[model samples]
Target: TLLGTALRPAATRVMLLGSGELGKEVAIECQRLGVEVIAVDRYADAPAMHVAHRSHVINMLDGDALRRVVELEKPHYIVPEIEAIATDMLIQLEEEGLNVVPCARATKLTMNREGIRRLAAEELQLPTSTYRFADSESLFREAVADIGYPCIVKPVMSGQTFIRSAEQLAQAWKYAQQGAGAGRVIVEGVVKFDFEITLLTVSAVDGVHFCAPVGHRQEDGDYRESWQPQQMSPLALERAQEIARKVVLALGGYGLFGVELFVCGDEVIFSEVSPRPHDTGMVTLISQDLSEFALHVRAFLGLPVGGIRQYGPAASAVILPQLTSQNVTFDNVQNAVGADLQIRLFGKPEIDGSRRLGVALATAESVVDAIERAKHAAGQVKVQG
Candidate 1:
C-alpha cells in the first residue's frame, strides 16, 4: 500500500468509531505511521480525541449519524473501537466499497453474544460451552433447567450473572436485562477450568501470528489485572493457538483478534472473541516490543508482522475507583513511581460511580513480582472525585 501525507489530497485517513482509551492508543499508533486519525465518539473530549487530527461526537449506534460522518470524512478505513455500533450500516457501507477494518461481518457477528456464540459453536464447529438462548422469563427458566443449576445467564448484549439455584432465576434474568430494557439471554453450562487466557491473535499480509498468552483476574466482569506469558503446558499452548487461528481465519480480517479461551488440564475450550484490541491484552503495553495497538494498525494497513518480541514478565493493573464527580483528580500519583513502572490515566472527563480511570504497568524479574508491583502502583494512586 502507498503511504500518503496527512492533510494532502492523497492522504491516507483512518476513522475510529469509538474513542476510549484503547482507541486512544490506536490513534497514537496511526499517528506514528503518518495516518490521519478521525476520532468519533458519543461524547466530547474522549481519550482518543485528545490526540486525533480531528474529532466528531455522535451516537455511534445511529445508522444515519454513522453514515453521515463516514461520507463527510471519506476515510480509507473505518475501524470500530467498541461493539455498540450500527453494524448493519457498516455492512452496507462495506458493500458500497468502504473499507471496514477487519471486515463488516466480523464486527456485526461479534457485537452480541448470540451471533458469536452460534458462530463459534455451530457454524465453526469449535469446542465451546453448551448454551441456549432465551427471550422470555418462562423460556429463560426452562433453558436454565435444561442447562441445569450452576449455569450462567447473560443478556445477549448485556451483563452476566451466575445462577446457582431456581430461586435466583428471576433476579438473574432481571439483572441480565438491566443494561437494556429487554433483551434475549444466553444460558451457558459453566466450564470448570484452571484458568482463562486472552490469546492475542494477529492476521496480516504475512500470515496468522500469536502473542504470548495473557492471564487475567476479573472482578464484576471487568479485568482488574493482567500478566503476560501465562505459563501453560506446550500442548495446551498449541491448542490455544490452533483454536485462535481457526476463529480469526473464519472472521477474515487483517487485524488483531483477542481470543478468550479456557484451559482445563491440557484441553483448550473457546470462550469469547473481540475483533480488535482487547482490554486484557493491555499488558502488552509493557510486555512486548510492539503493543497490541501498534500491531492492530499495522495489520489493517496491509503490513506484515515479521514477529512479536516478548520482553520477559510484565503486568498491568487498573486504577478503578468508586465515586461521583465531574472534576475527577488523582493525588499521590508519585507514590506509585519507580523504575520500569508506568501509569496511564484514561483522561475520562467524569466518574459518576465506578470507572477505570487509568492503568499501572510494571515489568519485573518474575510474573509474580510484576503483578505485585503493578497492583501496588495502582493502589498508590488516590482518586478524588
Candidate 2:
C-alpha cells in the first residue's frame, strides 16, 4: 500500500529542530543514505551544525520562526531532536502534506507530560503511575497535597529541601517560580520499584521489535553509564515488551522509541518514554549489529529490520565536562582508549557549563567488565582549556 522513493530531490532532505549531540549522530547516518541534513539551533555552531549541509540559528520555540524555515526548505522529513519546539505548527503542516519522522500527533503529545499521560492512561489504559496536572502553581501546590511529582526538565531539590516537611515542600514549590521558564507541572504517586530500565523499542514496516532492556545510573539528573541486557525475569521482560508495543502502536508510526519502566520483581510500572533513541541506549553501538540510529532510519523509511543480533555484554559511559571554557581540549585521548573500547567526541564548540562532551564505549565478556572498562576510559578523558 505504501513505498519509499528517496533521492526525490537529488537527495532526501532532513531538517533537524534541535541540532545538539544526538542530532549529530542522526545526521551522520542520514548522510550515509545520501540525505541532506539541515541543522537548526538557537546558537551558532551547535554540535550537529558542524556536519550539516548548512545550519540556522533561531528560536525553535517560536512557531512563526519554525514555519518560515520549514516552508523555505520544503524538506522531505522533519525530525525533532528535542521537546522545545513548535509542534502545534507540525500538526498543522502535516495536514498540508508534511511528513514528520514519527507523526505530528506523537511529537506534540510526547512533548507534554499531561498530553502523553492521558493518552497512555486513559486511551490505552497502560499501567502508568497515578498522576494529576495543574495549570497554576497554587493548583500545583494543592495537587501536591492531594496526588504528588512528574517531568522533562528535572525538578531540583536543595539539600534538606524535602525531608518530608510539608512547609519545606511548599518552599520548594514556591522556589521554582522564582526563576524564569517555570510553568505548569504534574504530580505523580511514588511507585515503589527495584530498578528502572529503558526498553529500546522499535516499530518497523516488518513489525514491532524490542531490544534487550538497558540498565543505567542517573546522577545530577542525567545518565552516566548504561549496559545492555539488564538482568530481568522472563515475566517482567514479556510484560515490558507488551507495554511498549501497546503505547507505540497507539502512537502509530515506524521509528525507534525509548520506553522507560520501573521494574519491581514480576511487576512492571510505566514511568515515561521518549519517541526516539535514548541517551542511555548508546551502548547498542557495541552490543547490537545495528545501532538504534540506523534502525530508526531504516524503519522510518518503510524498510524492514529483519532481526537484531546481540553480540554480548556491552556498556557506554558519558564523558561529562565539569568546567566552562571556550577552547575545550582533551589531554589524554590515547591513554583513555583501551582494547575493545571506542570513543565518540561530540564536536561541541565550548563547555560553558557541565555537559556531556563525549562518550566511551566498550564490549566485554560480562556487563560488569564492560562497565568498568567503559567507566575507566570515560574518566581518562581530560577536557581542559
Candidate 3:
C-alpha cells in the first residue's frame, strides 16, 4: 500500500519542444495534471502554443538557442514532441544531468534513421527489412542495387518531412544536394506486407506495454488516416510485442515509443519508430481511457499505468491546408461534429504545402465505420486559403 500511497513529486514545470497538434494534446494533458508547460516552436501561434501555459518561438535547430530556453525554464522534464530539433545537443544536455522525456539517447537515436535502424537490427537483432546507408549518389545507387529497386531512400535522420512518390529516389538526390544536410541517407528495401501498423509501446519502471494497434494509410509521405484497435492475428500481436520490447530495450529509456511494423501474414518486420507520442496515435483522443499524450505524461512522470482500455473503434483523419495564409477559417466544422465525432483544429497562423491544419476524430462500432466517419468529418471541415 505504501507504493500506492507514497506520493511522488508532481511535475510542476515542463518544457515541450515542437508545438504541433500532437504537442497540443500533450500540453492539454499536462495542464489537466496541474503541470505548467512552456511550448517552444519555430513560429508563433503553433497548435500547442495556443493552449500552453506560455510559449516561445526560436530556431530549435540551433543548439545554443535551445540551451538558453532550457536553462531559462529549468523544467523538471524536457519533452521533445518533435524530431526536427538538434537532438545531439539534447543528448549532451542529458549528459549534464538534464532530464529528457523517455531519455536523451532515445531522442537522438530516433531523430536519425541510421541510429535507430542500426540499434534495431545490429544491436537488438529484431526482424527488419534490409537497409544500407549512403552519403553520396554513387553510394546511394550501390546501396539501392544491394537493397534492390522499389526500396525506400530517405534522409537517415529526418521525420516524415518529404513527399512520398515512386520517383522519391530522384527527388531525394535533388533534396540531398540542396542541403538536406550532412546526415547520412538510408536506402531500405521495401517490406512486401499486407499492411502497416503502429504499435504505441510504453516503457515504464514496470515494463513495456502496448496500446491497441493502430492501422494507418499513408500517401505523399504523410499519414492520411488512422484507425485504432486494428484487428491483428494473435501471432502477429505476439511478434509485434516481442519486436517492440526489443526496440524499447535497445533505445533503453522510459516513456512512450511508436513502434512501426509491417505485417505479412504472421511475420512482423520492424519498419520505424518515434521515441515520443506518434502522430498516428492521435486517435487515442476518442478511443482510449488514457490518450497517448496522457499516458506519455504519466510514464515520464513515473506514474503507474494501470491498464489501457479501448472504448470502441476510433479513427482520425488529418486536415491539411494547401497554401500559406495569415487569415484562415474553417468551412463546415460545426457540420462535421455530431454524435461520436469531434475535430481539433491546430489554429496555425500560416500554412504552406504539406502543413497539417487539424484532425477529425470519430468513433463507431467497427473500424470501417469509424474510418468512414472520420474521413467524412474531415471532408466537411475545410481550410480557406
Candidate 4:
C-alpha cells in the first residue's frame, strides 16, 4: 500500500463522522501520517473540526446528508467516532466502493442495543448480564419480572434508570421510553462485580494486540475518571483478554475496540464494546507509548502494531462542568500543568448544558496517587460559559 500527502490529488483521505474530543485526537493522528482529514458533525467548530483539513456540519443521523458528505469527500476510510449515526447509509456506501473503517456492519451492530448484545450473549455465547428487549411499557414490565428487581432499564442507545421496586417501574419505563424517543428498551440484571475496566483491544494486519486494562469510574453511565493497569489478578486479566479477543475479531476489520468488562474476583463478564477509541482510554495519552488514537489510525491504514508500551500508574480525570453559554472560555489552565501532569482543553464552540470541557492526565508512583493528582489538576481549571 502507498501513502500520499494531504490536500493533493493522490492524497489518502479519512473522514470522521463525529467530531468530538476523541475525534480531535484521531484527526491529529491522521495528520501525523499525512492523511487528509474531513471532520463532520451536527454543529459548527466541533473539537475535531478545528484540526481537520476541512469540515462539514450536517445531520449525521440523516441518510441523505450523510451520503451527500461521503459522495463529496470520497474518503478512503470513513471513521465513525459516535453512535448516533446513519449506519445504514454507511453500509450502502461500503457496498458501492467505499471503505468504512473496521466495517459498516460493525458500526451498525455496535450502535443499537439489540445488535451487539445478541452478538455477544447469544451468537458468540459469551458471558453477559441477563437482559431482555422490550418494545413497549407492557413488554418492559414483563421483561422486568423475568430479570427481577434492582435491574437497569436503559433506552436502546442512551442512559438508564434503575428499578428497585414496583413503585419505580412506572417512572423507569417513562424515562426509558422518553430517552429512546422511538425504539426498544433493554431491561438488564446488574452484574455483581468488584469494578469495571476497559480493555483497549486492537485488530491489525499483523495480529491482535491489547493495551493494559484501563480502570474507570462512571457516574450516571458517563465516564469521569480512568487509570491504567488496574490491578487484576493474572487469571482475571487473562480471562478479560480472552473475552476481548473474541469480541474484536467478531466485529471484524482493522481498528481499536474498547471491550468493557466487569471483573469480580477471577470471573470476568462482557459488558459492551466500542468499535472505535473509548472515552476511558483517554488515559493512554500519558500512559502508553502509542495512544489509542494513534493505534486506531495505524491499524485502519493497514499497518501493524508490534505492541504497546504503557508507563506505570497513569490516570486521567475529565473537566466536566455545568453551564450554559454560546461563547465558552476557561481559566486557571496553566495552574493544572506541571511535571508529569498534562491538561487537554477541547475547544468546543458552545455548551448549553453540562459538558466535558477538558481532561487532566498525570503519572505518579502509584495508581491511587496518579488518580488524585489527575483529579487535583482537573479541579484547578475554571470554566466560564
Task: Report per-prediction Cα RMSD to one decimal.
Answer: 1.2, 3.3, 3.5, 1.1
Q: TM-score for all predictions?
A: 0.98, 0.92, 0.93, 0.98
Candidate 3 lDDT, 1-385, residue by residue in tens: 0121112344477799999888898889888877788999998888898888789999999999999999988887899988889887898899988999888888888877888888889888888988888888778767777877667767775522232444566666666555334846887777888989999998886777899899999888789999989888999999999999888887877788899999999999998899889989999999999898988888888877878999989999988758878788998678789999999887788866668888999999899999999999998986887
Candidate 3 lDDT (Cα, whole model)? 0.84
Of the pair 2 and 4, which is ahead by lDDT?
Answer: 4
Q: Which residue pairs show backbone clashes in model 2?
A: 148-188, 149-188
List runs of model 1 lying over 4 Å from the truth: 180-182
Q: After superposition, how far is residue 369 of candidate 2 from its true place, in Å?
A: 1.3
- Which 10-residue span in candidate 1 carries the lowest summed lDDT? 174-183
Q: Candidate 2, residues 1-385: lDDT per residue as tens digits?
A: 2332344546678898898877887888787777788999998999889888888999988989999999988887888888888888888888889888788888877877777888888988889877666657577667666754332211321111221435555565554445212455556767778888999988999999998899998886689999988899999999999999998888877888999999999998887778888889889878898888887777877789888888889999999978878888888899778688999988788887788999999999999999999999998988896
User: Quick one: how many clashes does candidate 4 have?
Assistant: 0
Instruction: Give the per-residue lDDT digits (tens) of candidate 1, residues 184-250.
Output: 9999999999989999999999999999999999888789999988999999999999999989999
Name the regions of candidate 3 deviating beyond 4 angstroms: 1-11, 159-171, 179-183
TM-score of 3: 0.93
The candidate 4 region of ten consecutive residues with least summed lDDT is: 174-183
**What tens digits encode model 4's per-residue C-alpha lDDT throughout 11-36?**
99999999999999999999998999
* Runs with alpha carbons beyond 4 Å of true place in candidate 2: 1-9, 148-163, 175-182
Local error of candidate 1 at 39, Å? 0.5
Clashes of 2: 2
How high is the CA lDDT of each candidate model?
0.93, 0.81, 0.84, 0.93
